[PDB]
Amino acid sequence: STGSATTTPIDSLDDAYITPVQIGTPAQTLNLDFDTGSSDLWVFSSETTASEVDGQTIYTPSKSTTAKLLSGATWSISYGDGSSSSGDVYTDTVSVGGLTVTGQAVESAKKVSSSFTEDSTIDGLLGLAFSTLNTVSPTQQKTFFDNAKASLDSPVFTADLGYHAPGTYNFGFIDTTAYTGSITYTAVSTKQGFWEWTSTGYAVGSGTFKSTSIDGIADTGTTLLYLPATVVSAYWAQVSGAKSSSSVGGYVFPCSATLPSFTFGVGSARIVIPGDYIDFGPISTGSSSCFGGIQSSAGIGINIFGDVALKAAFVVFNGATTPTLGFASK
């Protein structure tokens, strides 16, 4: 089997991407944030505290003939941005882009933090990291991808995120028309439950490539590119007036600037992030200070190849027995 679904930016900054997902019988379609940095499929639901729901579409298990309470199971998750959610668990039929899993754990939110409530466009998350990170207790549950894997033509999914435009998540096949040149594959460590890999270095603009190992995670659920302070300082030094602002929470730059590109290495290959992808616009409406899309990972504890980096590439998440990641230009 295979699946193919379009993923769409939630706003004009590509802050996140939503993908329609069918849950239950008859189908209830919710727009979920596919997150390769976590491993829970959770939704706003008929159980979510009413004051914490503001415009989201909810899953109502009592209206699904295939929903079953997973008795005694609870879940609770906290994300790197400080947001969180928790609740109980149903199993139900879940379909993405024509690919159906029966018996998928659908985590029903009883509580969500403010950032989720305030984002009316995101109806929940669909985790695509390794199932060892799944938070369901006392019986850990599998991700949609892990459940689908045996049925897939090939044990892979791909992320093809757009810049200010829709893109695609495919399951079970590699669309050879969706990228240019060749795909370069690189080793993954699953020790921390993430799609963790080592970039071979970077360049700023037209500058020389610096060969240096940068361990980090491929994370579709993180907006920006978070890299070591040395690397980030080298980038922003090439932008007149750019500075790190503790009051704002990172690097800002004059909105009149033209940003240089940023290149990262994948083995001997190179992925180029255009300068425009690094512009996250005014820090507040009407401001001439703009927020940067490359930020320091210092104090996160991990480097994160988020959407800024991933949307510059066609990315293969290879879930074979020995997992790997592939990157191609597009």
Side-chain angles (χ1 to χ4, degrees), residues 1-62 64-67 69-109 112-141 143-148 150-190 192-242 244-330:
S1 61
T2 63
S4 181
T6 299
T7 193
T8 302
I10 65 166
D11 63 23
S12 65
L13 300 177
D14 296 347
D15 281 318
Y17 298 78
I18 50 171
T19 308
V21 177
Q22 283 70 49
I23 309 174
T25 309
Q28 298 180 40
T29 298
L30 274 65
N31 296 328
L32 305 187
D33 183 351
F34 283 22
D35 181 14
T36 63
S38 69
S39 307
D40 288 50
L41 192 175
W42 75 260
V43 297
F44 279 79
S45 75
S46 55
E47 299 180 330
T48 310
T49 301
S51 62
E52 296 177 350
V53 183
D54 189 4
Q56 295 79 10
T57 295
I58 63 167
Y59 168 59
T60 303
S62 66
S64 173
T65 60
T66 43
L69 181 73
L70 186 62
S71 181
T74 60
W75 63 280
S76 180
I77 193 162
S78 300
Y79 296 101
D81 68 350
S83 69
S84 63
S85 53
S86 62
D88 55 19
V89 187
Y90 293 82
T91 55
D92 209 339
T93 302
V94 173
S95 301
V96 176
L99 170 66
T100 301
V101 167
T102 57
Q104 175 63 46
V106 176
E107 303 172 34
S108 170
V112 304
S113 64
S114 302
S115 50
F116 288 116
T117 299
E118 294 163 359
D119 189 352
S120 66
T121 70
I122 291 175
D123 301 324
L125 266 65
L126 189 150
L128 293 168
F130 293 88
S131 294
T132 53
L133 294 179
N134 175 267
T135 77
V136 177
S137 181
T139 307
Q140 189 171 59
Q141 300 295 304
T143 71
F144 175 82
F145 178 53
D146 265 0
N147 282 323
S151 306
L152 294 177
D153 291 358
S154 181
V156 305
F157 67 92
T158 64
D160 180 10
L161 302 179
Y163 168 65
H164 293 348
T168 306
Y169 283 103
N170 289 330
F171 292 83
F173 72 107
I174 289 162
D175 180 357
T176 60
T177 72
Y179 57 88
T180 59
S182 52
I183 305 175
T184 299
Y185 291 87
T186 196
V188 164
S189 172
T190 64
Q192 297 192 87
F194 299 120
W195 293 92
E196 187 172 0
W197 64 290
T198 302
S199 172
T200 49
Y202 70 99
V204 176
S206 60
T208 61
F209 186 85
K210 176 72 171 181
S211 292
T212 184
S213 293
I214 305 170
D215 180 284
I217 66 168
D219 187 359
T220 57
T222 290
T223 313
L224 306 185
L225 174 53
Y226 294 89
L227 291 173
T230 46
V231 178
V232 176
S233 182
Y235 178 81
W236 289 109
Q238 297 305 310
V239 179
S240 297
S244 185
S245 168
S246 53
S247 57
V248 175
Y251 280 91
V252 296
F253 67 93
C255 295
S256 61
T258 302
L259 296 178
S261 64
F262 184 90
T263 301
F264 64 93
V266 183
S268 57
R270 307 288 180 254
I271 300 294
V272 179
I273 305 170
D276 292 345
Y277 290 26
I278 299 161
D279 176 21
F280 279 75
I283 61 170
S284 294
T285 302
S287 181
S288 70
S289 181
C290 275
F291 197 71
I294 296 177
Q295 296 294 343
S296 178
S297 63
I300 295 178
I302 199 161
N303 300 306
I304 308 175
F305 293 86
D307 298 334
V308 164
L310 302 181
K311 74 186 166 197
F314 177 87
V315 187
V316 181
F317 294 78
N318 170 28
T321 303
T322 299
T324 65
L325 274 170
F327 292 81
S329 297
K330 66 187 184 189

